[PDB]
């Protein structure tokens, strides 16, 4: 027949399907942005503590660091400022994890073509549900940028 059977095995192993950087689909992402550009720790901003901690960004895993520069800056006026130094990292909130996987993969700017900008998220192991911790540094306290 068809309904009744003994052996049950479905082969659906498909290779890695790349997403169209242009025709990609936007997905909800959680990002933690600080107003001092510091990778201190989660204690600075936990998940569900304040609205100024984690922000929603409809980005695409196959997005270039640049796209992330706008996504966050758009959801965070503190970044819209010119000369804003934001560092993209991967950190998780208080959970059943060790607490050492928190590291940065690259940092962009608000109108400044960096080296990581041309880089894509997919390379930083960024996927759906992933935890990205961006460190926004205003131009008022940014010694590197032009000023003094």
From Swiss-Prot:
There is a cross-link at residue 12 (Glycyl lysine isopeptide (Lys-Gly) (interchain with G-Cter in SUMO2)). GO terms for biological process: mRNA processing; negative regulation of DNA-templated transcription; negative regulation of mRNA splicing, via spliceosome; positive regulation of apoptotic process; regulation of alternative mRNA splicing, via spliceosome; regulation of transcription by RNA polymerase II; RNA splicing. Residues 6-19 have a biased composition (Basic and acidic residues). Keywords: Acetylation, Cytoplasm, Isopeptide bond, mRNA processing, mRNA splicing, Nucleus, Repressor, Transcription, Transcription regulation, Ubl conjugation. Ubiquitous. Pfam families: SAP18. The keyword Ubl conjugation applies. The keyword GTP-binding does not apply. GO terms for cellular component: ASAP complex; cytosol; histone deacetylase complex; nuclear body; nuclear speck; nucleoplasm; nucleus. Residues 5-19 are annotated as: Disordered. Residues 92-148 are annotated as: Involved in splicing regulation activity. Transmembrane segments: none annotated. It is found in: Nucleus; Cytoplasm; Nucleus speckle. One of its GO terms (molecular function) is RNA binding. InterPro entries: Hist_deAcase_cplx_SAP18, SAP18, SAP18_sf. Found in a mRNA splicing-dependent exon junction complex (EJC). Component of the heterotrimeric ASAP (apoptosis- and splicing-associated protein) and PSAP complexes consisting of RNPS1, SAP18 and either ACIN1 or PNN, respectively; the ASAP and PSAP complexes probably are formed mutually exclusive. For the ASAP complex, the association of SAP18 seems to require a preformed RNPS1:ACIN1 complex. Forms a complex with SIN3A and HDAC1. Interacts with SUFU. Belongs to the SAP18 family. Component of the SIN3-repressing complex. Enhances the ability of SIN3-HDAC1-mediated transcriptional repression. When tethered to the promoter, it can direct the formation of a repressive complex to core histone proteins. Auxiliary component of the splicing-dependent multiprotein exon junction complex (EJC) deposited at splice junction on mRNAs. The EJC is a dynamic structure consisting of core proteins and several peripheral nuclear and cytoplasmic associated factors that join the complex only transiently either during EJC assembly or during subsequent mRNA metabolism. This is Histone deacetylase complex subunit SAP18. The lineage of its organism: Eukaryota, Metazoa, Chordata, Craniata, Vertebrata. The gene is SAP18.
């Amino acid at each position: 027949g068809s309904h009744m059977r003994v052996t049950q095995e479905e082969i659906k192993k498909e290779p890695e399907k790349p997403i169209d950087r242009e025709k990609t689909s936007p997905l909800l992402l959680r990002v933690f942005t600080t107003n001092n550009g510091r990778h201190h720790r989660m204690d600075e901003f936990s998940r569900g503590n304040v609205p100024s901690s984690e922000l929603q960004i409809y980005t695409w895993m196959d997005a270039t660091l640049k796209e992330l520069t706008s996504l966050v800056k758009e959801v965070y006026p503190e970044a819209r400022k010119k000369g804003t130094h934001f560092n993209f990292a991967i950190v998780f909130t208080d959970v059943k994890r060790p607490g050492y996987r928190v590291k940065e993969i690259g940092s962009t700017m608000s109108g400044r073509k960096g080296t990581d900008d041309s880089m894509t998220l997919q390379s930083q192991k960024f996927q759906i549900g992933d935890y990205l911790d961006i460190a926004i540094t205003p131009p008022n306290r940014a010694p590197p940028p032009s000023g003094r």
